[PDB]
Design a binder for these strands. Sequence first.
RNA 1: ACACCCAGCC
Lengths: 64, 115, 49, 545, 79, 140, 148, 240, 42, 147, 96, 257
Amino acid sequence: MIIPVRCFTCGKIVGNKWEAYLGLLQAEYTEGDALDALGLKRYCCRRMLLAHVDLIEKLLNYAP
Amino acid sequence: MNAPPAFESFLLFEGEKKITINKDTKVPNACLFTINKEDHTLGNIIKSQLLKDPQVLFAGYKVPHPLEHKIIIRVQTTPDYSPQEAFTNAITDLISELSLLEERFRVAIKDKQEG
Amino acid sequence: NGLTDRDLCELNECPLDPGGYFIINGSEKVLIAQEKMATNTVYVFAKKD
Amino acid sequence: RVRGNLMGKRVDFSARTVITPDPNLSIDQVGVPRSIAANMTFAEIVTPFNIDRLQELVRRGNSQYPGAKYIIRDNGDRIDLRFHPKPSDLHLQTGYKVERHMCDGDIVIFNRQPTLHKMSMMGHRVRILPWSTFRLNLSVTTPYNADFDGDEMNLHLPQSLETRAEIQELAMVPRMIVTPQSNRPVMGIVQDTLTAVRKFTKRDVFLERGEVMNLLMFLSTWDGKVPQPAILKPRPLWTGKQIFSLIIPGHINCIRTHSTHPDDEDSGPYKHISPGDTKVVVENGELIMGILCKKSLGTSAGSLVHISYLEMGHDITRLFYSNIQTVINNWLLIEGHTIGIGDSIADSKTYQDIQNTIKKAKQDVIEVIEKAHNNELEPTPGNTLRQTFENQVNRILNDARDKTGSSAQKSLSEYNNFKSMVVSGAKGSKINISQVIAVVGQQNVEGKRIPFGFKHRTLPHFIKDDYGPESRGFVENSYLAGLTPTEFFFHAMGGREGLIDTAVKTAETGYIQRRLIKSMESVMVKYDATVRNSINQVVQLRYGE
Amino acid sequence: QKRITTPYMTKYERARVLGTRALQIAMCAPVMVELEGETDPLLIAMKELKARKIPIIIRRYLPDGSYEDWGVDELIISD
Amino acid sequence: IFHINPRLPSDLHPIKVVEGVKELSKKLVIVNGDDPLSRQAQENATLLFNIHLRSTLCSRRMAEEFRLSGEAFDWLLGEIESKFNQAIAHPGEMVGALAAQSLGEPATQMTLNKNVTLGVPRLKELINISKKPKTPSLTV
Amino acid sequence: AGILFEDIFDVKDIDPEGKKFDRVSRLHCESESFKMDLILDVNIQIYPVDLGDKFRLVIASTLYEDGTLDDGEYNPTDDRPSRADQFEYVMYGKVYRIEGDETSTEAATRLSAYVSYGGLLMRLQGDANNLHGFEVDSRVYLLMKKLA
Amino acid sequence: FASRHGQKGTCGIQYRQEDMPFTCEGITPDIIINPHAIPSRMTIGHLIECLQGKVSANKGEIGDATPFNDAVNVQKISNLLSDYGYHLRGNEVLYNGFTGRKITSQIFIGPTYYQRLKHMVDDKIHSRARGPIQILNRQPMEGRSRDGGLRFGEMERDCQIAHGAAQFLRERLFEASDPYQVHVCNLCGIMAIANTRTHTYECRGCRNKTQISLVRMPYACKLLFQELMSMSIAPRMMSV
Amino acid sequence: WGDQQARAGVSQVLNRLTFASTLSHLRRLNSPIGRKLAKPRQ
Amino acid sequence: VSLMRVLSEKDVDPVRTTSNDIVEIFTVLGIEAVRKALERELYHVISFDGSYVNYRHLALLCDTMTCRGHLMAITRHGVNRQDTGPLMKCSFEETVDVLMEAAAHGESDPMKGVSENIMLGQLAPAGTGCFDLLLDAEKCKYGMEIP
Amino acid sequence: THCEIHPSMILGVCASIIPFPDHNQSPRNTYQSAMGKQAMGVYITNFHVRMDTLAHVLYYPQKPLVTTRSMEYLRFRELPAGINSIVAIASYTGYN
Amino acid sequence: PYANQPTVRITELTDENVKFIIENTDLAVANSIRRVFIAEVPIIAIDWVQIDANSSVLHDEFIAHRLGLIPLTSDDIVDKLQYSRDCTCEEFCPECSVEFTLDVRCNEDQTRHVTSRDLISNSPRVIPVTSDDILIVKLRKGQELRLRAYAKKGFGKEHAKWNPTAGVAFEYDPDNALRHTVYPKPEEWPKSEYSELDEDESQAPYDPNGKPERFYYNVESCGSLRPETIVLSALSGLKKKLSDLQTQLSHEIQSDV
RNA sequence: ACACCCAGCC
Ligand SMILES: [Zn+2]
Ligand SMILES: [Zn+2]
Ligand SMILES: [Zn+2]
């Protein structure tokens, strides 16, 4: 529902990189270059941040 | 339901002992060091250090079950050299190794940071 | 029927819900299409039994 | 009432949960969760020479484990231990019964459904393990017909000492290694252990000193003497067969042949020195030549397990099973096994050969179609012209499939893992390799080719009156290359036929089996060695004549 | 009496005899063989069977109407 | 077991082989008795095994092919007797249920379908009467 | 001194039927002193050999040059001067079968000795006058050194 | 746990990160499945998915895997993978986690879409020891959700017959399920009236008060015979 | 499906374990053949 | 199948000419002939795929179906027509009809079978239950008695 | 007279999530189609308002790295039912 | 006395990872050092979450789980902080735990991002490493998250939250001089970044009398510890474990005599 | 109870 705090495989912190990744994508960066600029070199972290769905954004549409 | 607490992999609660000695009756001068609440980390180094000792004829370890936290190290030495002495010497040599490596690592870190 | 996604969310209903089901006593009941032989057509079969 | 509540009825002291593998258990052991052990109980009778242990179990109570749940007095009153805090009644006398939580070493009947044959309810020794699944050695999966894809199994705990004794002495797993159905070992080495022991006993496996004494740790029947290495200089090296000789028990003697044993090697000059190392000879309990596979370690008559069982009883064969599994798995840690895309790709020459073979086969089928279209096809005796044409097409396509498969398997390197699992017999077959690499082959529905479901067409995409290979469901592509849509649909038809057969034949076979059971549920061998039914009518004067 | 049944003791006879003797031992019966610290009734019964000392007579029922009494001691133990 | 050298001559008297085989044949009893009926039944019950025994423990085969010694031959006779007596069907064994399970367990693996019916349908065809077959035939 | 066989062999061929195994190769060799014939499976990674190489076989029943039975246990902590010092490839194995050319009447004249070294097999054919120390189920050592 | 190609599987053991194998880059697998699941079932699409997932994760693009795309084959995926510094067939050199030694055979490792199924063990584990018993039969209840007992059916009964373990069969079908006692008249064979508190046993119908036998039997058999009597069938319990 | 010899299972509780499951259930077809007859199953 | 006509034809072997049909063999050749033919046909069915089943099980099945002179089907129409006790038959199938027949004819079940004892909860005469155990007073008197 | 829009539209909802279905044995595809109905992701966005008798919600669903063009219309991208896992096909300790 | 004489050369040292080389050492010692890096280096992580109010779309256990995985600075205080189990306090105290407090309420129109910056800790030496920040949860107007947490000391054997590393890349013998792995087709395999071969060669010639002697490391830190401190703590911890084992062995030997 | 679905493993 929300970006995991840590990569499941290695444990690198990726919970702080989702907003930066979205901002980079809005800056007309391709996904590969956006991931590279964020320091995600191993393909496990690239999997983690590339395949994530931000379902919390849709969950926040309902009134509390 | 039946999930064990995570801390049982490295904690001894009242009743168990960290190490026990059991003579092996199959061959002369052999011991079965049973170590509780350890894993391959302390098994592999002990086996490798024992293998260097020329008076150690056999030195192996096993983990009887990956879910049980216990290792069994079998050591058989020359008639003129006790297995317990071999185990103690192996641990002492490993400690000396690690102390030397720590000191050299600290020196290397200082050198790299300085320039 | 005509509610947009924001209206659906404000009304506590998932926009992605396809619908197509009834709500009977609170249970979401779906009707499964039932196959039947075509009507009004002549059919010649092979009763060998 | 009769079939539902008298012949078979729900029972107490039964557990059910999912089974998961555990190669570190013996074949006669079953892992049991802590909760299951703490729930069901076994009633021990208090005696003067075990009263201290049972008193301690009573003191521990139901909360802790191992402990007791009930104290049954001699008269008959039952005291529950989670409902009484005063220690007045917790004193035990001789003749009292204490229902203790089942602990290590308790005998349990372990069952899977459907209960097809006798070996599907064998006795195991309970071992308590942390998580929430029953655990089985991999060898006993074959008699149970059980895999670990979510299978659940029942565990019945015998209550009295007489029933426990007979389960121990009649139906424990070691006593059921050899079935009487076909006088062969019902259990055997399977899967990772079989592939890895095919790899291990190859002629070119040499183990350093450290690996050897690492492997010997897992050998339970080891006398403690490290054998002389096969190679003394320039480095001490042990061969794989040398370690497996230590695994082999006693002094059994056996001769077998590897799967890849050439037929002509027996008549050749190198009969007793195999170039391929394919003649397994175990002499005086030592494996001196050959490579082990399913044909010398599996569920086959005359295999090493069979010889071990018939020479050294049952317990030693149990230790043999466990030793093979543990040692070979711990060597597989080093050697490792895998399967990948690289194992499904042949050389460019092989692909060219397969494509040429398929082109020639299609050309031959078109030639036969043209011959039949001009009424130039003489029908074979005993068949119609249509049947003759179908037979010719089927034979041509089967020959094409066989040739393509042979070409595919001619090019596999020794390092290919598909071949590694096939020749070891662990899993897969030559047909599977052929299908993955070269061509899936013809798809059949009800034995014939794909029927003309539409108006004289298999699918709308073909023209009417098309008897060629592509139209009637010959998948010319391999699984690696991918199926085109039409042959994908035809393959789906074939698979659906398989599923229907699997899901329908059960409801016939179960009723046939049940009728066979109830026909002769009472026939047994009486004490004058005659075989009689319940009415004492002699069926056979001696069993099996 | 010229008994006709097999002199060997069957697997079923072994199972039943061991079970019965274990139950008897667990009920404070006199053990017929010395024990070096064994406390399990099954183990004690198995040891008491290894020696030919179990006090049980197996009554094998022939088909027609008759029976035959075989001492557990006077049977060949198959193990 | 006895480290028999297959090259040096053996010290096994062929008359000893004959006497040993004949004596062993009298210990492998399936139908015990003395009257002619029991004797004939005993001869028939072990006819095939006795033929195999006399073929394998032949005088010439033991003298030339196997070349066992006297001690080895005595051990072999003892082992054959022990293994045979362990193979006799134990009384009380429910062979009917065992046979039914043994014939019903393969049935779960067999598939369905000149044409000759085979598999589970033929098993139904066989264990019933079936006054009308499916695929009659005569192998003339 | 336990020397069952002693000769120098020429490597006539290597793997005539093909590279059956990566680390082990089958040498077909022929001597010239006694004119024997030795098929031998040797490890190649630890000890390479080339076609047309001379090497000395000193196949013996004991390395300790005293006749004392070794009994076949690994004893790396041994100081006595065994025979495995003058040879650069030492092997241990069992003589698992001895064939020949026997008739019903005549004695053996051309013997074959088959020795399995933990899996690596060897066949030694020759005149029966040389293969007498070989016995079935006898544990022997194979000694090899190449000659310059 | 199941993949997207019908590759089922239950978790067998859970190793920590230091115990699991690892590549030269420090990547450890999240899941390890046996090779033997592949060849018999020929889920080659699983392997192609693993390769394409590796290429996609490295490239940074959700790779296309439409069924009948002619532009995507194994060779193109392999060539793309080779450009990122990996073996073109997706294999890698894994190191044994326990010892750190290189595994001799290079392992096929890559991203693959796994999905967890609702069949969790904690919703399946079940046990019983003298729980509640149902009304009509006085036998164990049916289902985990009532602490019911597992059914010892007809085929289990025959399997235990084949074992010959008659005592175990009796314990399962009589003592462990529903033991019961009845009183039966000896002259006739009908169940008699027994007042155990006052110790008065009589069989109205015979005017018998001194010849009564106590018979152990399953409650189900008593129910069967009582239904038969209500059906005007008289099973007479002749104990002599 | 009829008055309170009629079809059963025409209406079922919608499967809400996964969105794919809901979609699959909403697009299901049933054949009234009894549950024998291998031909309609093909 | 017209076995007896084909056998009698000129130039046709009357020795090896067999039929896969079972009723024709029984009605033409005999009861032992149909026993042997049933054996061969069952073996042909089982071993067609390469599977092997020990001979004695096939022998027991063939003997059971041909024990009572005529062909005995493995069905209600062949098993419930034997002289077995009513309770075994009612446990098999056609339960109420069998019990009605037994009640009408006053049949007595002698408890000799296995299902009969299982239903009544008694020790089935099967394996461990096919005999009785007795206490040996003389042997118990002798020897050692620690307690 | 006609042309298919795309052959991949012969599959159903649960068979369209399979990547490379034509490289699979067809029984495997059938079993997967019966499997995705049992996979647990986020079954509906308003799951915190509904009160169903059973409900399973995965913490971290991920859209598949290896997609199929058909799942852009099944909304599998917005409600995934699994995680991309670094799977290694190996025989490690015999526990698989 | 047959101990080795290991040597260390450090190639790279940044604030995120350290890349060094160990020479003249057993394979077992290097592997155990790697395993200690992963799973036996203590750090401080949140392990006791108590939630007062949680109106977010994420349930309480989810928030606690995401809080536990936030790395916390543990440079020097981890040595002076005792394990909660060994401490004499009743439940928790400053000498064996660190107190965190989170208190966020969204009342603005736009979404509020409860990040790791909102974790206020009494102890100044223990803070979330991001002080972009780690996202804990997004909050709509009207939703509040108010909780208090306690962070213990632990190592990776207990839970992955106490893992300080972010992938320990371990390598040895980059060219198969030892043939520990047999390439079926060596030409197809990419060369390791530590390889010492030209383009023509695929792998080094076989070395029959060689052992693993050089080990290349790349210890990447999640943020809890500096990488140099991860390695130093690892070596110290392994030494301490071995010394404790030696003490227990000495006691057992003296008791057996 | 009862009935009906669905589902798991063969
Ligand atoms: Zn990562
Ligand atoms: Zn009466
Ligand atoms: Zn404190």
